[PDB]
């Protein structure tokens, strides 16, 4: 079954940038994506590091998963910064916070979709691929 993490126009894995202040969550997301064929191009533990790394890899990042509550720089501020730098960025918010207006505000600011924790492989994957239509 065509692993979803592969770009079938080249056979090269899609690149994912994982951003969360918990190494536990970074590991869970890493397993979820790699098991499906994706390549974790890089990871960041806070919003500042995320911005730096996103710019560093920029043309090559296909998708970014972004936590909200984080030291130094929270995910909402990070989202605006990444979208400001690259209007074509594809970011999926993955957070413990789910107030419905917060969701709309992130989408307004540019995020493609939102995922509320606790996580499960199936859900994450279904959401990740919806930002993959043409």
């Amino acid at each position: 079954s065509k692993p979803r993490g592969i770009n079938y126009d080249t056979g090269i894995p899609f690149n994912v940038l994982i951003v969360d202040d918990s190494v536990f969550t970074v590991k869970q997301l890493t397993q979820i994506f790699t098991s499906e064929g994706f390549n974790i191009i890089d990871t960041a533990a806070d919003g500042e590091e995320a911005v730096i790394k996103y710019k560093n890899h920029y043309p090559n990042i296909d998708i970014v998963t972004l936590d909200i509550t984080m030291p130094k720089m929270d995910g909402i501020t990070c989202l605006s910064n990444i979208m400001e730098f690259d209007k074509n960025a594809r970011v999926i918010m993955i957070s413990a916070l789910g107030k419905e207006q917060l969701v709309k505000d992130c989408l307004i600011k540019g995020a493609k979709t939102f995922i509320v924790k606790p996580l499960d492989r199936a859900k994450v994957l279904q959401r990740v691929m919806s930002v993959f239509v043409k």
Partner: protein, 154 residues
Amino acid sequence: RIDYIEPFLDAASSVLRDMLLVENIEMGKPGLKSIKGVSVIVGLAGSVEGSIIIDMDIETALFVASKLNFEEYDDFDDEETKEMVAATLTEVGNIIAGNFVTTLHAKGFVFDITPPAFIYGENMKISNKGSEALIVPFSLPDGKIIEVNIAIRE
């Protein structure tokens, strides 16, 4: 008044049952009073001031981290097991707190949370007390107790 008691109990019980999959996380008797070991602290900010604190002994901390990472951790003093233990428990705190404040767009305020803190090899985290406290112990199949505490700042 911001009615948080039920939202809190629902969030704490709901998240633990959804994350740790071990049949029967039993809610103990909520009580105004208390609990070394470890402690996770998530501050509550915005209109309400307070915090959510989760405490358990080292054995329970390892058990929980082990179940959530699906791999055995039995040496909390190992330099990288300790790293994952801390990161895992603080994330549990973050999720309980986040789901908690989320069920609050039941009020005309704003309820925020802070990044979590991990306090281990701790002094029975004296986070003292001069404001609405509520300790709720959850029992795991064995004798292991996880206490979830919320102290709002009236």
